Amino acid sequence: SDKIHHHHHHMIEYRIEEAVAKYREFYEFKPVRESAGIEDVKSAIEHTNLKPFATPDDIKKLCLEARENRFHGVCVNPCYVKLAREELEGTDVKVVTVVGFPLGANETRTKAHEAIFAVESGADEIDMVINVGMLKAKEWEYVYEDIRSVVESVKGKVVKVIIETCYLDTEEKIAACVISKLAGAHFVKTSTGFGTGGATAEDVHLMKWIVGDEMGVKASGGIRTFEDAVKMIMYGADRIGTSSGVKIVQGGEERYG
Amino acid sequence: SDKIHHHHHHMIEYRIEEAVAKYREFYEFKPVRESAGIEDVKSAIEHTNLKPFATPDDIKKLCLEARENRFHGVCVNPCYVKLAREELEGTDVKVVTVVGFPLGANETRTKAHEAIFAVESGADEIDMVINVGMLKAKEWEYVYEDIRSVVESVKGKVVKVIIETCYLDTEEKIAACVISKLAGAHFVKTSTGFGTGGATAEDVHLMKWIVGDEMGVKASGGIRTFEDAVKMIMYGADRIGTSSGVKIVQGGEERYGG
């Protein structure tokens, strides 16, 4: 009903304003952790290949690298979820895929179907993209329902919302986090890697600050080195999205081992 | 069954090899048409905004520009098909959207559902992305079924297959066109605009030469000027994917007249 959705849109706007007011009065940028070691970095890494030209052989190599390095999970496009699941069968390495990715501009019902299909094919977690255009137009109820439909469709499974920080101002980043939390998502995530920018420590920390300890932040896009990964964890990242995990581990062992 | 899929995979391989043979023996790069005017360019343009940050207001403006300039269609992300249809009601400007776009790496059923939903919402045509990685792995039957399932799901609507030429060698461009044609698609298209390169006259001509005169070629990615649009049409493009349509038209009028 319009009445119900209009009221709900209003309550979202007030929650966003509350967060912005608290940010303006109390926010300060500083680390959340003293340090981060090699094992902490491995445990945070979701080892990723989302290239449109990746082959089945590339995915097999990615899953092998995840086993060898003890990464948290792999992240692959939906067409390769079944393959990744078979390659990792018997291990604790998670299979993560992406929904409505990388543009976030699918019909909500397509996102919801893609998520359902992914879980049926063996995904443990879903990283979806927010509708950035609709967020920028302040259509909060649309953005809410878009995330909520995906969350409810795979309830019991982890859903991460990619907010695509590179296209947003500070208040829009805050709005994206607040809406993702209200909709029952488990993580917010910085970037698709297909936009104009990637993870910054400033964005990661703001996100963690807004969402709190009980919701995850995943830093992604441009994380190439051990130092990059450590920085993101020190400023509040719970997971890292990268395709450079092999070099990250090698740099950690070489420079800090 | 697996025998039937196996046999069909082999059949496709033979069709690709036949096309490559013809190309090696007979291909010559040259223009298909001696020129193109402003009315030709307008008729070819699919006026596009697929930016993830596009707002409803941006889409309304896009549709206005398409009506003002008498372009063939607009091309918008699926969330905006119903909006574009409403904005164009009473005109014959087509509403085009994109499926499995831009990475082509969704499960086939997801592409097929997305296409059905887009047609239910009011799309006239669908531009889908080929699964590039499975093409590069020579999984011809997978690639065929992925296209065919979409085509059949929206029977009666035009389906274009984006082959994403920037990631393919010459033989793979040929294979992508042969498969697209066999699967019943109506057009092949060069580029998503989210890869590492866009349309070239050499790609457009090669694709038109392989698919022939009863299948279309849409040139897309990096088409900025009137002269670029004319070039693509001269070498075999039937449609132009661009966001620069306003400057393309103004450009042709200023430099060559109405």
Q: Is A58 close to B133, i.e. CB distance below 8 A?
A: yes
Q: Is A113 close to B110, i.e. CB distance below 8 A?
A: yes
Q: Which residue has the tokens 């104009």?
A: A196
Q: Is A105 close to B195, i.e. CB distance below 8 A?
A: no
Q: Is A109 close to B117, i.e. CB distance below 8 A?
A: yes
Topology, domain B1-258: TIM Barrel (3.20.20)
Is the sign of the CA dihedral A37, A69, A243, A211 positive or negative? negative
Q: Is A78 close to B106, i.e. CB distance below 8 A?
A: yes
Mutating which of A103, A129, A139 best tests the B interface, going by the most B Cβ atoms within 10 A? A103
| Radius of gyration for the alpha carbons in chain B, expressed in angstroms and rounded | 18
With vertex at residue A186, the alpha carbon angle to CA A183 and CA A189, rounded to the nearest 5 degrees, is 100
B196 touching chain A per CB within 8 A: no
A1-257: which CATH number, 1.10.760.10, 3.40.50.300, 3.90.1150.10, 3.20.20.70? 3.20.20.70
B131 touching chain A per CB within 8 A: yes
| Radius of gyration for the alpha carbons in chain A, expressed in angstroms and rounded | 18
Cα-flanking dihedrals φ and ψ of residue B178, to 5°?
Answer: -60, -45
Q: Which residues contact A211 (CB under 8 A, 6 or more apart)?
A: A177, A180, A181, A188, A217
Contact criterion met (CB below 8 Å) for B243 and B49: yes
A5 touching chain B per CB within 8 A: no
The burial of A142, by beta-carbon neighbours within 10 Å (0-12 exposed, 13-18 middle, 19 or more buried), is given as buried
Å between B112 CA and nearest CA of chain A: 10
Question: Using a CB-CB distance cutoff of 8 angstroms, which residues of chain A are in contact with residue B79?
Answer: 105-108, 131, 133-134
Nearest to B113 among A55, A79, A113 (CB): A113
Question: Could you tell me whether strands A216-220 and A187-189 are parallel, antiparallel, or unpaired per DSSP bridges?
Answer: parallel
**C-alpha count within 13 angstroms, C-beta hemisphere, residue A38:** 14
Question: Could you tell me whether strands A239-242 and A216-220 are parallel, antiparallel, or unpaired per DSSP bridges?
Answer: parallel
Mutating which of A58, A99, A106 best tests the B interface, going by the most B Cβ atoms within 10 A? A106
Q: What is the DSSP string of chain B?
A: -HHHHHHHHHHHHHHHHHHHHHHHHH-----SSS---HHHHHHHEEEEE--TT--HHHHHHHHHHHHHHT-SEEEE-GGGHHHHHHHHTTS--EEEEEESTTT--S-HHHHHHHHHHHHHTT-SEEEEEP-HHHHHTT-HHHHHHHHHHHHHHTTTSEEEEE--GGG--HHHHHHHHHHHHHTT-SEEE---SSSS----HHHHHHHHHHH-TTSEEEEESS--SHHHHHHHHHTT-SEEEES-HHHHHHHHHHHH--
Give a three-class secondary structure readout of chain A: CHHHHHHHHHHHHHHHHHHHHHHHHHCCCCCCCCCCCHHHHHHHEEEEECCCCCCHHHHHHHHHHHHHHCCCEEEECHHHHHHHHHHCCCCCCEEEEEECCCCCCCCHHHHHHHHHHHHHHCCCEEEEECCHHHHHCCCHHHHHHHHHHHHHHCCCCEEEEECCHHHCCHHHHHHHHHHHHHCCCCEEECCCCCCCCCCCHHHHHHHHHHHCCCCEEEEECCCCCHHHHHHHHHCCCCEEEECCHHHHHHHHHHHHC
Q: How far is CA A235 from CA A19, A30, A198, A204, B195, in A?
A: 19, 7, 15, 6, 32
Å between B157 CA and nearest CA of chain A: 19
Residue A247 amino acid letter: K
What's the start-to-end Cα distance of chain B, in Å?
Answer: 59
The burial of A164, by beta-carbon neighbours within 10 Å (0-12 exposed, 13-18 middle, 19 or more buried), is given as buried
Q: What amino acid positions of A are annotated as catalytic residues? A: 127, 189, 218
Contact criterion met (CB below 8 Å) for A127 and A101: yes
Distance CA A214, CA A227 (A): 26
CA B159 to chain centre: 8
Distance CA A25, CA A127 (A): 32
